[PDB]
Design a protein around this ligand. Structure first.
Ligand SMILES: [Mg+2]
Ligand SMILES: [Mg+2]
Ligand SMILES: [Mg+2]
Ligand SMILES: [Mg+2]
Ligand SMILES: [Mg+2]
Ligand SMILES: [Mg+2]
Ligand SMILES: [Mg+2]
Ligand SMILES: [Mg+2]
Ligand SMILES: [Mg+2]
Ligand SMILES: [Mg+2]
Ligand SMILES: [Mg+2]
Ligand SMILES: [Mg+2]
Ligand SMILES: [Mg+2]
Ligand SMILES: [Mg+2]
Ligand SMILES: [Mg+2]
Ligand SMILES: [Mg+2]
Ligand SMILES: [Mg+2]
Ligand SMILES: [Mg+2]
Ligand SMILES: [Mg+2]
Ligand SMILES: [Mg+2]
Ligand SMILES: [Mg+2]
Ligand SMILES: [Mg+2]
Ligand SMILES: [Mg+2]
Ligand SMILES: [Mg+2]
Lengths: 207, 153, 257
RNA sequence: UCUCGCCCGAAGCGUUUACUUUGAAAAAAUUAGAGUGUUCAAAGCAGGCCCGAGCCGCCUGGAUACCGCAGCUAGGAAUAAUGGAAUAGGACCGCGGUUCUAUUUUGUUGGUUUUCGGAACUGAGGCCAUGAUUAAGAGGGACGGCCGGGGGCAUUCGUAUUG
RNA sequence: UACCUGGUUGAUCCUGCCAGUAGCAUAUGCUUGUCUCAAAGAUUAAGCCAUGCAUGUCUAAGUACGCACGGCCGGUACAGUGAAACUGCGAAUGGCUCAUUAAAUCAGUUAUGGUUCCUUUGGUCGACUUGGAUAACUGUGGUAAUUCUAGAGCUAAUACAUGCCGACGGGCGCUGACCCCCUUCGCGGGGGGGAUGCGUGCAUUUAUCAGAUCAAAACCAACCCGGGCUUUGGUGACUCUAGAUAACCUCGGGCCGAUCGCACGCCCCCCGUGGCGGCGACGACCCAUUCGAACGUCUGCCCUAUCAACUUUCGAUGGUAGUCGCCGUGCCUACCAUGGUGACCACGGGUGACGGGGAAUCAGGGUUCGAUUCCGGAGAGGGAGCCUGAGAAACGGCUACCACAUC
RNA sequence: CGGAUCCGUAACUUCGGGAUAAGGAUUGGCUCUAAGGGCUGGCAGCCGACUUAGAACUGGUGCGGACCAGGGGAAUCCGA
RNA sequence: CCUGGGCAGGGCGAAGCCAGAGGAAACUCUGGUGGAGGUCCGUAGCGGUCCUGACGUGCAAAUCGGUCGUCCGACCUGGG
């Protein structure tokens, strides 16, 4: 019975408009489904024109894009911090279109090893994890190609992403609508946006 | 600068320029849209700083439909001003005119500086930006009298 | 109201169908097709009212489902199928091959055409696009969406189309000096040489055209059908060259009788 | 301007109106009006020619006009208001330097430097007949010889009345 | 027909109104022979309704073992007509009324590049037939009954569902053992081939990269030949269409025919136990046209000031993010700013106000109606909510309250 | 009824009042969130005050939990 | 008359002052600051309306319990 109509409003001045419709069908309103961080649970919604809308009541996994290196991987959602539109939704842990998600940084480690070998984020131990780090021995000139990938491209993921990879968490901005398409899709906060949101989260934890 | 929670229109910032170590500039990757219609994009949208969703030269606001002209009356509303369109109305019985005006609101893009009260501005039809703002400021025309004058303090 | 309209009144029917007031209340509603309602002509109007083949509409409904009347090569089972400007009507038994061009008054003038020209058909390009796997498509005002058309076709062109295979041939562009025929507005059915186009940023450009014996008229790009190449019409057009002379000249023609 | 193929098209293009002449502009019915002997007429859009049935028939109409006001286009420049420059922060021509990019030719690729297209800033002089319509039997202000029971404050005089 | 006349006074002239005059459209009186058209429960009561009708629908072509009819008729299911039902579409059009409604609806003009769209028209569509369920039907019933229905048995399909074969694997990308040539004593330096493993198509959801007007050079290290070469389209604009890159593609699961009829012939031959299959109804993911919707832009509405300030905690105006919606929208939420309108009449009331095209009235100018047959809006006693469905806040659909009202 | 917070307040009038007019809602417990400052430097770091507002959760509708504590309105006569 | 002493907390918010808006001017409107009063609720203090309560050979030859009126003043009170 929710009407998003614009005929129950005041005018440009503030004079009251007289009601004469009966909240017609082409101006529907459906209640909000605040998407949690539990398991996967998506209902369907019939749309005018027979289309199908995917209502995500709670989500676990998502699809997230690294910004610079162009690597998009599947990622389990950890936590919701600093929605910056409504601080109640931070406590509620609600997924919305422009929200921030703690990416579990595990599926980027294997790609960073496979493409930018001699990796980092390995707790500064250098003795554990028999990953098959140095087993294939990199026989042909593709070892030199990986040397071009590691030294000429120089692999700089400077100290913000260094500390986040050592902590295992990563900061992400959602770019999809979880209430419309039912997907937790987003990108990784990189550089200036990353230090901006990090300053905001640090100030929020401070004061 | 920015006094909000995020301002970044379309252009991806990170080219990963870190190869030997240099600061460099950051005003180069700016989305530069030309509206067409024989109307020049001002240089404030070239070497500016503002980030606006509703700007005709920066945002995704497509200018279509009608092209009108008003006079700037008030500034006191944030990033949008109120114009006045004076016009005459022919009446069949008495066989002469009368003055009528309709004060409309219009989105003033922050590239247009020197927007002092009393100058004829050109406006263009767009999508509904808000409840009362449908037009968009297109070109500031009039110099509003004389600009040479200066006073004490 | 709720949903689409489904009936149609004779009074709200368009003028160019030559309908009546005393005969009936409802008008034949044209079904959805490749032509809009203000620029179409139903088959029941073409047979019952225009050629005078059947007095009632039920006889037309019987014969169009007894599979005689076909449009553009294939048989239309509907009694109220929409036709339009520059179409080929052919019925299968005698020499009855009707082109639907516009009369100078603004009516659907009948035109019996030889089969060697009735096999072919001109059609105006409505727009052009690209699609699946990067292939080009062309959209016709006759709702023909043809893939892999040509690279040398502007939006406002006229391309000859085949009726048997649906293949395009013989494209002609919108150039100063081509022969065109105005199809919409107050100057419909006006055949004249393209004289001048004037572009406007308000998405409606104007075109001044001239014809024979020194006359000129202005129209809009949404109402122009290019028909020839420099006073060389590809289609034979009936009742002279399609010219509105003068009401006084029509009275003089009637006095000449 | 010859910027795109000695003249022509396109584009630079109006500072924006008010007023007028075109043209497009919409839906009909209705109104005026063409034709048509519905037995006239109100009507309707019909009908008319040759054939003793023997032409497996022909021809034509179902137009036009108005559709205020509002919006679009192309001309007109009289009347009605608007700014051009006046602390010059004027308009034109061509020279000084700073500063910036794209893509053509050096046979290509990666690195440096220019001419070049122009945007941004700045310095000096010359060119303008160098720029302000004269001053309403319009108006405001100033002057100086008066003017008047004009107004306010204070003063003086005069009978008479009453005691 | 650009039209006046009687009336104040003992009499004249004037301002002045009253009364006559002529249509219009409602009612009524009197009277009535012919004929052609012809409005007609609008004004008060959008008050209440008994009764009877107003929405159903079959092709050679979805499903036929109905007990109903009967082809000659033998058997190797089904020749055909076929009531009833499952399925699909329609019942969101038409018809009726004007009670709300005063920039609200409408009307002229513009655009959706900010959206959806049944059907039609074109493009697209690269396991010799699988599994349960059920109606009609047969018997058994319930109460005073409804267009009421449980339970026993049965079988169907384009109702529901599951689901492979074809098709060579082309080509691309990442890894990739190994291999070819030159130099170096070797290490090493440079160029060129290459099986396995992983993904591949369209649409959805992301993120990234490249994307059109411009002509002369000066050097450094490699090499193709005898100084010398290479490229999607459009608008006025785009974050348009179309490319490439890495992943998702959501069980309430996007597509990639387990459909149906027709008349029938041919071929290699190892039977045909296989192909040669032509036309036609179903929507099938998507893209455009078409029917229409939707919110927008400019302009236009009667009377009233005994309606001069109105709007804002409960959004009034704007900005930034989000929610919802088909999309842009203070439509909704959180934060921030104090805005927005008005003496050119807003705001607040009244309308015996649905808006127009139009109708009446004969100089011109105007004045008054328009519920009414054409378009658009609103409602089905009041208002609220909603399934199905592309389209409804539907009412000859449903649910609950109020007033009536039936057995 | 009684305190406090947020709405809303009439007849009349000396325009000051009437007025805490009248009539409603909330009030507990526990977690949070936001806002309101000082001192050090050529925009950064340390230290503490008790207030207000909003949100969620929960208890047998209980919440001024004891105590503290205005029943109200319409009138007449008289005296300001 | 002289000389000393004393009166918890809240509510109403006058003059004056500041800022903003309107207007040609007169001036008006809004939000604060301010703390005026023989001003309101109310304690101590001072008096004593009602229960015509308790006593009524009582605590008392006039007192006690609730309920009270006023409490910055025309206020209460000691000593000379
Ligand atoms: Mg904290
Ligand atoms: Mg009279
Ligand atoms: Mg209807
Ligand atoms: Mg009414
Ligand atoms: Mg809010
Ligand atoms: Mg008249
Ligand atoms: Mg008249
Ligand atoms: Mg509407
Ligand atoms: Mg309705
Ligand atoms: Mg009724
Ligand atoms: Mg109905
Ligand atoms: Mg009914
Ligand atoms: Mg009182
Ligand atoms: Mg008291
Ligand atoms: Mg007293
Ligand atoms: Mg007192
Ligand atoms: Mg009192
Ligand atoms: Mg007391
Ligand atoms: Mg006493
Ligand atoms: Mg006592
Ligand atoms: Mg007693
Ligand atoms: Mg006793
Ligand atoms: Mg007391
Ligand atoms: Mg007191």
């Amino acid at each position: 019975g929710i009407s998003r109509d614009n005929w129950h409003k005041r005018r440009k001045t503030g004079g009251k408009r007289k009601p004469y419709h009966k909240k017609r069908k082409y101006e529907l309103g459906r209640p909000a489904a605040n998407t949690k961080i539990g398991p996967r649970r998506i209902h369907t919604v019939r749309v005018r024109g027979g289309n199908k809308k995917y209502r995500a009541l709670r989500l676990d996994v998502g699809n997230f894009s690294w910004g610079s290196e162009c690597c998009t991987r599947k990622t389990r959602i950890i936590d919701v911090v600093y929605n910056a539109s409504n601080n109640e939704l931070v406590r509620t842990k609600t997924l919305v279109k422009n929200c921030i998600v703690l990416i579990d940084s595990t599926p980027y480690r294997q790609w960073y090893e496979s493409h930018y070998a001699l990796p980092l984020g390995r707790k500064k131990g250098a003795k554990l994890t028999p990953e098959e780090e140095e087993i294939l021995n990199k026989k042909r000139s593709k070892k030199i190609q990986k040397k071009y990938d590691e030294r000429k491209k120089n692999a700089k993921i400077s100290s913000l992403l260094e500390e986040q990879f050592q902590q295992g968490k990563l900061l992400a901005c959602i770019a999809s609508r979880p209430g419309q398409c039912g997907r937790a899709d987003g990108y990784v906060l990189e550089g200036k946006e990353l230090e901006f949101y990090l300053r905001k989260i640090k100030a929020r934890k401070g004061k | 600068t920015e006094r909000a929670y995020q301002k970044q229109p379309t252009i991806f910032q990170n080219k990963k320029r870190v190869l030997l170590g240099e600061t460099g500039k950051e005003k180069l990757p700016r989305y530069y849209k030309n509206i067409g219609l024989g109307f020049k994009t001002p240089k404030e949208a070239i070497e500016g700083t503002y980030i606006d969703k509703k700007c005709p030269f920066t945002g995704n606001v497509s200018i279509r439909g009608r092209i009108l002209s008003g006079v700037v009356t008030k500034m006191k509303m944030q990033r949008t001003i109120v114009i006045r369109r004076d016009y005459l109305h022919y009446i069949r019985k008495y066989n002469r005119f009368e003055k009528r005006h309709k004060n409309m609101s219009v989105h003033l893009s922050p590239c247009f500086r020197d927007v002092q009260i009393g100058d004829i501005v050109t406006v263009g039809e767009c999508r509904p930006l808000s409840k009362t703002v449908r037009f968009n400021v297109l070109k500031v025309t009039k110099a509003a009298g004389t600009k040479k004058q200066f006073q004490k303090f | 109201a709720r949903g689409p309209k489904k009936h149609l009144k004779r009074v709200a029917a368009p003028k160019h169908w030559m309908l009546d007031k005393l005969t009936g209340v409802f008008a034949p509603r044209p079904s959805t097709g490749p032509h809009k309602l203000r620029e179409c002509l139903p088959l029941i109007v073409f047979l019952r009212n225009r050629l005078k083949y059947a007095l009632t509409g039920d006889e037309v409904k019987k014969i169009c489902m007894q599979r005689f009347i076909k449009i553009d090569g294939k048989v239309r089972v509907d009694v109220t199928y929409p036709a339009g400007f520059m179409d080929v009507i052919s019925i299968e038994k005698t020499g009855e091959h009707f082109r639907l061009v516009y009369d100078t008054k603004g009516r659907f003038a009948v035109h019996r055409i030889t089969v060697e020209e009735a096999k072919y058909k001109l059609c105006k390009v409505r727009k052009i696009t690209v699609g699946v796997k990067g292939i080009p498509h062309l959209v016709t005002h006759d709702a023909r969406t043809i893939r892999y058309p040509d690279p040398v076709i502007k939006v406002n062109d006229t391309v000859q189309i085949d009726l048997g295979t649906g293949k395009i041939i013989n494209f002609i562009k919108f150039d100063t000096g081509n022969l065109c025929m105005v199809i919409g507005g107050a100057n419909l059915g006006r055949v004249g040489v393209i004289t001048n186009r004037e572009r406007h940023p308000g998405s409606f450009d104007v075109v001044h055209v001239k014809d024979a014996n020194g006359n000129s008229f202005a129209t809009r790009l949404s109402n122009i059908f290019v028909i020839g190449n420099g006073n060389k019409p590809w289609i034979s057009l009936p009742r002279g060259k399609g010219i509105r002379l003068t009401v006084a000249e029509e009275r003089d023609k009637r006095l000449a009788t």
